[PDB]
């Protein structure tokens, strides 16, 4: 059981996965569009991210989770909504920092991205 932690939001065009970790970074629980019940493209939607972040925060609270730091990676349609849900969850959200990974022109992207 741990009091403060982290919440990572991985938001892609296809899905939103939210995993809640301890202070050192190790996961306590996680959820996603799939876990909350959707398959296919519906997983990618804002309503999907909502249920996901809730279920992720709901599961975290029963381990004593109370305050979290919010880390956001992605530019998916579920992103901003995912954050809404974490705030409205019963969790503190001491911060919201975006650590989306971007290359300083690295590996050649797949063709869909050119």
Burial level of 59, CB count in 10 A (0-12/13-18/19+)?
Answer: middle
With CB cut-offs between 5 and 8 Å by kind, which of Mg ion, RNA, another protein, none does residue 1 bind? none
CA distance 28 to 26: 7
Among 2, 4, 35, 58, binds RNA (CB under 7 A): 35
Task: Extract long-range pairs of 31-38: CB within 8 Å, 24+ residues apart.
Answer: 31/55, 31/56, 31/59, 33/78
Q: Which string of x and - marks every residue 19-48 that binds another protein (by CB under 8 A)?
A: ------------------------------
- CA dist list (Å): 62 to 18, 58, 76: 16, 7, 28
Nearer to another protein, 51 or 72 (CB): 72
Token look-up 């892609």 returns 12
Q: Which of these ranges, 21-29, 46-54, 74-82, 93-101, lies near another protein under the rule CB under 8 A?
A: 93-101
Residues engaged in binding another protein (CB under 8 A):
95-99, 104
Residues engaged in binding RNA (CB under 7 A):
6, 8, 10, 12-15, 17, 19, 21-22, 24-30, 32-35, 39-44, 73, 99, 101-112
């Amino acid at each position: 059981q741990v009091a403060s932690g982290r919440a990572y939001i991985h938001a892609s065009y296809n899905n939103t996965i939210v995993t809640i970790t301890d202070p050192d970074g190790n996961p306590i629980t996680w959820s996603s569009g799939g876990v909350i019940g959707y398959k296919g493209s519906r997983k990618g939607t804002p309503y999907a991210a909502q249920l996901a972040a809730l279920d992720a925060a709901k599961k975290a609270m029963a381990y004593g989770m109370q305050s979290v730091d919010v880390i956001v990676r992605g530019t998916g349609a579920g992103r901003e909504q995912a954050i809404r849900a974490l705030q409205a969850s019963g969790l503190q959200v001491k911060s919201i920092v975006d650590d989306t990974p971007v290359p300083h022109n690295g590996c050649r992207p797949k063709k869909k991205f050119r």
